[PDB]
Amino acid sequence: HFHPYNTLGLATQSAMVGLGAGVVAAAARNSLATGPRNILTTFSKSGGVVTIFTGASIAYVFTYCSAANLRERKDGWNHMWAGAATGAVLGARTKLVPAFIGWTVLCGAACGLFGWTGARFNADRKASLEQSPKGFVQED
């Protein structure tokens, strides 16, 4: 059928992926201004973009594997109920209006509702399920 995931096994590897993304990209964004200084003050500019990356995995895929343990069998409907928690870290991006953080939670959930796997394959002529075989015609 399916297999329940190692929630810690995905979780710590995903958190290291998020931290590596925060190093390689959220510290790469130091070209943007004329406040120069290299290393000690890059993270003064960039404390607010690191853990936006690292917290995103800890929000998302932890919720994803826990949903796979709760509503099992690996359905796409996990994702909509996963990425909403990602919006919570998006809510930590802007603690201005909790109505806007519920707004960005539900919109991030609807965004996560669809992005299951882009560039699907092995669907030579796609989108034609076939019924039980009785010399079928209206599929491919």
Binding site: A28, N30, S31, P36, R37, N38, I39
Partner: peptide, 18 residues
């Protein structure tokens, strides 16, 4: 200069690795 070696190591080290 060190002020022009600002934001140098912070991307060039990762770029040399990549």
């Amino acid at each position: 200069v060190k002020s022009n070696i600002r934001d140098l190591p912070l991307v060039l080290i990762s770029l040399i690795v990549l």
